Symmetry: D2
Subunit: 471 residues, 4 copies
Amino acid sequence: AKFPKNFMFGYSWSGFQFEMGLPGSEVESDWWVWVHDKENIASGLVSGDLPENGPAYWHLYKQDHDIAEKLGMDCIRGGIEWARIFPKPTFDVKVDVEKDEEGNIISVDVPESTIKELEKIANMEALEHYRKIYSDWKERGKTFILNLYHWPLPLWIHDPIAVRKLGPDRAPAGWLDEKTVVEFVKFAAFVAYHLDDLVDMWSTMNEPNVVYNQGYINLRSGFPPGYLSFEAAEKAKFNLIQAHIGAYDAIKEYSEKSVGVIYAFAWHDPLAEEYKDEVEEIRKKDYEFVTILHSKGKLDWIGVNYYSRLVYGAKDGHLVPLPGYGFMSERGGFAKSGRPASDFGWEMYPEGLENLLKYLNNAYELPMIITENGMADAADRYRPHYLVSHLKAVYNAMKEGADVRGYLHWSLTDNYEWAQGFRMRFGLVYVDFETKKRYLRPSALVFREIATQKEIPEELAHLADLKFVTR
Amino acid sequence: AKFPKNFMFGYSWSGFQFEMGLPGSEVESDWWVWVHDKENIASGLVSGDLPENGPAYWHLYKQDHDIAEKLGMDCIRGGIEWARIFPKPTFDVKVDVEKDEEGNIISVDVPESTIKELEKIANMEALEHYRKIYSDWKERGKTFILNLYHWPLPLWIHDPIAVRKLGPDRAPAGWLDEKTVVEFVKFAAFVAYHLDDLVDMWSTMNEPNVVYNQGYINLRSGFPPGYLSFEAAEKAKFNLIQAHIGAYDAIKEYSEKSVGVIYAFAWHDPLAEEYKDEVEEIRKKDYEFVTILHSKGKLDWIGVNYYSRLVYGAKDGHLVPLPGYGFMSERGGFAKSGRPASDFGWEMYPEGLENLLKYLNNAYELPMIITENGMADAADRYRPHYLVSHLKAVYNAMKEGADVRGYLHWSLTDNYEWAQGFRMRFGLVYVDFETKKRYLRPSALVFREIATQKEIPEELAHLADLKFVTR
Amino acid sequence: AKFPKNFMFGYSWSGFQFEMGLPGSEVESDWWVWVHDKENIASGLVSGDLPENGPAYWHLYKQDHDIAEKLGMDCIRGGIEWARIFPKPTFDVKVDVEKDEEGNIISVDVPESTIKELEKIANMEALEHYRKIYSDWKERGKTFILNLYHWPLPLWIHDPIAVRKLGPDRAPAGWLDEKTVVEFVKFAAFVAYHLDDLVDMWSTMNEPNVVYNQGYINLRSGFPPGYLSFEAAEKAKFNLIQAHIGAYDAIKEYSEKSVGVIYAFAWHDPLAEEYKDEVEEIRKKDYEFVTILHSKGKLDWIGVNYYSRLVYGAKDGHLVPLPGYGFMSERGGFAKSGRPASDFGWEMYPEGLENLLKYLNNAYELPMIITENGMADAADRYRPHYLVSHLKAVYNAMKEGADVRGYLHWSLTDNYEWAQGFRMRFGLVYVDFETKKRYLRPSALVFREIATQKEIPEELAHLADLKFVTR
Amino acid sequence: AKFPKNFMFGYSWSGFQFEMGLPGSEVESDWWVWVHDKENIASGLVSGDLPENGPAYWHLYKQDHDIAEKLGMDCIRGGIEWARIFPKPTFDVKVDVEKDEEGNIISVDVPESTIKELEKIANMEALEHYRKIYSDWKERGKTFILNLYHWPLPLWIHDPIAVRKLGPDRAPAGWLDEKTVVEFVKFAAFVAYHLDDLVDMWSTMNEPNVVYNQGYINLRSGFPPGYLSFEAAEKAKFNLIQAHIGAYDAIKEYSEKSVGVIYAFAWHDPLAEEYKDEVEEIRKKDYEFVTILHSKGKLDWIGVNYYSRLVYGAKDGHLVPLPGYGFMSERGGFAKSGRPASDFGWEMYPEGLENLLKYLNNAYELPMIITENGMADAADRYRPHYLVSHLKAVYNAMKEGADVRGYLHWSLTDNYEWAQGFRMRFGLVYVDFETKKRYLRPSALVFREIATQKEIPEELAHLADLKFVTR
């Protein structure tokens, strides 16, 4: 299975999950507070593990890029933390955000002189270290994709403990406040101004569908602010749309490079033929966020984050996602299909990635990068087959017409998995979090062999076959 | 194993879990609203099962009592729903509740003239129907215990949804408002004034400890109001303590009979000897509600609810309840001890009950009744052993000095199990909730033979032995 | 579901599995020798458990009978051990057995004087003791059915240790020897001559198909002589066909009662439509033993021993019995259908019994008794559903034209389960094999209700429904 | 963990499991007939899988050597099939074997002339073909260890079907006949004479303890001749001892090289400290075969075959190997230790290897080579941990004084696992038995990296830690 010469291989990281781990890198944010909160800990909503025991990429990036480069990686999608760049309020510095009568952003203008006013109060030293990190990779002749937002927010933008104690109207409320969007636009233009020379492609945000569904409706996920409200989920979704559209406009002001989004795509499957039509409809509404963006002329590429599926059957009653399939499988065990599931209980289901890319291609006709794909698997029991099977799924989607430009694994190294803490290990490379030492997993050797030759060689082709892993 | 000739055998019920099922029985309350809320259903915090589809005891009590009487039961503990009796506010009817400067209730007066003012605003017809229920049982010549509180509150006392959305300072807030205690005292007086003729013993409230820990801390439990706050948990506990003292004084005003509380008593075990003293301290802390009441002389008997244990060992390196033991076992599986667990994941541990009763006997030296003991077990796979072996544990505690007057199984029939809906079946008697028909389970036959001879006879004695049920 | 007034309820026993356990009741036989053999034990072929530590029914029959009677039973099917009655060889006593040119027995004659030559050689004490046991049940006014052969042979007929060591041509080779048939004929006559006044129906033998299949083909079963040979399996089958023919004629010479056989009938199911025709054929081949007998006019009734099913599917097609179903389920767990499996790994499948009974009714049009039905279930987890759902099955088959005269559960008490020893517990009543005390299981109380009332009453009707037991 | 510059890495193979697969290579043997037998098949004693569908190393050795050499392997232990070399009896070719009074072989002499006589009835073409296979390896400059016996015997030496059907006194009885030892001696001398120039060290035989224990006692393993007898086991063992002595004496006549044996070594553990001593005696009894060889001065080296352990505990009065540990664990699952188990049910237990090597060093003081070590793992879930942890175990044992000259994995490729057929897959390389194509498993990559550097490098050190693999 040969990939095109220019097909990119590598990995993705986020600031909150990778940066911290050694003194010097700690930063405040809504997620930092959420995860140190004693009541969140005691009610078991977050694990009690702390991100400042993480992999310390803010300090060891040079060493981690050495690993990546030696596994034949030529692309990394990285992060920049709004909470770092602007640790104080930006409200006082005004910009032009234009809206239609239904409140869609129609144009934005952060002029150069306003940029210059933001520097006065940004943490310029943080900004410089980001340059160092990104330079260190660009200098090796490689591609860098920059994603502007990967969940945490400045504390002055979102106080999730107070939104939860007091109600969103009595606290700084993040995506629930129309103003956050404007402030984010400032941030997007300020990053695009200083950083364009280091960046090949932009993403405005990562998985916004997770931020609004988990923060405001799926409460046992342990996402901030854990404030259960349909109306809030909808508000937040509406405001992320504007954050994307505004960030897109803001970026194109200071860069001519392509700008997309990175979005969490479950693949939805019906248990049997009779629910095909309903599942098709769940799918239109689950991808809806992206559809909206495409129809507004605001996506140059789409980053596909794919991990697993959901299977739908009737219970009573209604059309429901079924336990024992896809994301609802038994942790560290087997789906009802016989496929292994990850340590996270996510079924290994590469054919969902293939179905997904045919669907997205025909849906939107856009250049796509796989921006996340990987599995929680501490012992590296299944990750070799995951990796090869998902790569063979990308390849096959390409033969049927999908425009896929690279494959970015989640992830190079183990890291802090949000409300689960450190127990979910997603790395090609194990990290002992006490010593910060890195170790290769055999999947890294498989990755090295495939990426360096730009193909799944015969001798490794059998790792796409899932027969022996499935009962 | 012979019991004393006055040892009672019977069962417990609550209003919310049993009364409804058939037209005419429905009634608004904080739980009614909680369990119907669309957002609580999507977030999977509640089952989506509805109490109006329940066993219909409100209509069907006569046949249920017929059943119980032929099981040889001679004592029943039942409830009475504040929200039913007072579905409109009682704030305006002034009463006299005196306090310490510390906020302790030191005396209560609800005089005859006030009782009568309260009648004008009470559902006097609802009251009459409770007389008919208790009376159909009392008239057969049996014992009846009335428990005044079993969790739901009038909507005008507690709006759980507004508390969660707005914060408890901006809505009627249940146990967080001091005023609720005072209204509760009016209610208690109202009940003892009108129903003393039909009640042999009183309990002021059932598992207050679950009310405040599930509601304010253990959010995964799905309890109203789902508002995370240690302070709120502490304040509700504080207030429930007053509710008990106030209600006790109020009952003594119109009645000379015994008054106690019914409490949830998990048994706490150390995984190993090194944890012994910490566990002794966890136990002291967990039972303190009762201890405070006893030291204040406000308990005439204690209602012991026992289902399983919790086992503690070290984590990181914290002391915590360990997955795989007691309440935290696999649903329908086995605990790490080999013992089976219920459909609810509760390890079968009759030795916790024998221990519990020695401990309580020694701590408080009061008459006790097992006011709840049972298992979620749809198929009656385990319930026969569950019953005889906890009955034998009771017998051993009594051989050792425990003053136990009675054993009341939870429950006679399957019923609505709060946030879990109907999937958790506790009945000796299966209920078809569609048809409302009752069918016996073999453990019913076991109960019948034991209660009618007031002994575990030889021929049934091996059912106390868990060897064959343990892996 | 009401049964006809004359439909019999009871149980079955065999001599090897029940008689021994107290000093004085031990007898040599091929099975005795087989299960005591040190190499058989060391090789894990037999359990190590010895049947002289069994329930001691030879001494304790009167108590077992009181239990039986008090459970509402009115019929017992019992055994007589050839190895007890004729402990020394009977070869030299001459009898007239006439055969076909094909070696079918055409007529038999054991004259009176030959019966008296047998008396000199027989253990007449043991005969009389069998009389004390049968009479004790008969004097109660109940029905007794006597089955002449239930597996063990005299050692002078079968030395399974020498067969295996030396080959069947150099040892006394049990059913591999045509002389064994002749000597069985003399036993049958001798028993009909003496015992006809105590017997209501006869069965010549119990599950002969298990004898030849397990002894000579399925070594993993642990059956003597454990000599792998299709040719021996075929020859053993053929000589047991004649054993039954010879025994029927020998019984009829001294009795006018119905003579039948008792056979192990697994129900065969196709996993899918496409194998139906082929499974139909499996079933004809599997029941051929009974078919042959019916077509020679040698069967007055049929005893149905039913426990579970086999499901057939392709595997290198090649139709094989599938693991995860019927007799091939997980011990103590769940079949792939979701049904619970017995301690023995036998899927609970009452529908197989209903199917079987219609099939046999149609094939043979003879009266049938269920001479075994039951499960290994040391804890009585499932036996109550097993019992009620299978009785419901029987009743359904009767509603449909099946001439069923009674239901004999396997069995009243736990007993020695052959190569498995005591670990498979089939009783309605538990036996402590140390003390020999009997204790009732809740399934006994369920049996007592149904049998005394001659009907599955509404209150227990839900025990036929397996929904709550199935995953 | 650095290994000494001359410490060898590679693998082992046996003729029966590897050679056949492509037309031209099939040979008759007791094992060939055993595994083709219809009754062994339908009995489920053997898998029904056939060796002539195996990896076809007889034709494809060259490609497999290429894979080996590129994995950095420098040593191979291989087989020569007696059944190939001498397909017709050698009884008539007289030889001089001198014995003790107690029957021990005292000396051996096969003169040149007799060697020439033997050539004339040997299949010399098969001899030249084995020369081709070994020489293809030797010419690469690598070490080759030739093992004379790896279970199949020529049919004129052993007809196992006939031994079972008739008893060993009436058939060619393999190791039950004294004469087989004499014939093996002729074979030993003949191979030494011809092949010494291709061989660096000799083994007389592989796992004799398995040959006689599985063949004559543990019938469930399905090994020929399936004849249960303690005294046949003791006979075969005695002859196998003489066989080694004679083969050693024969080889030494025609070679100056080291001669040893390859032995199956289970590590034996007490469950608790009280069984320490008994388990110690168990060890010494199980290894007696090797103690005897050494005390007779006929071991220049020991080949250690190590896979796993057996744990011992009380059952009734006596010590048994306990289910759920070591060789007795759940297939595909986990042992009760929390360690993962192979697809054969074998617990991952590297500690056993470390322990064993110190024990063997101390008992015998001999150069050892790990000649087999590996795991059935069709998906490579656990082999990278298996490999690295057992190699670390060796290294620690060498650190403490064990004289170990190399590690040979079982195996390079998937092959035919005896009674289990192909379902047990032990390769670093997967073989598709239909197309004969080879494919690397990720553990082959790990092996390559280790052997070529002759060290366990830092980046792979974590594969030795079994923490993440264990529950």
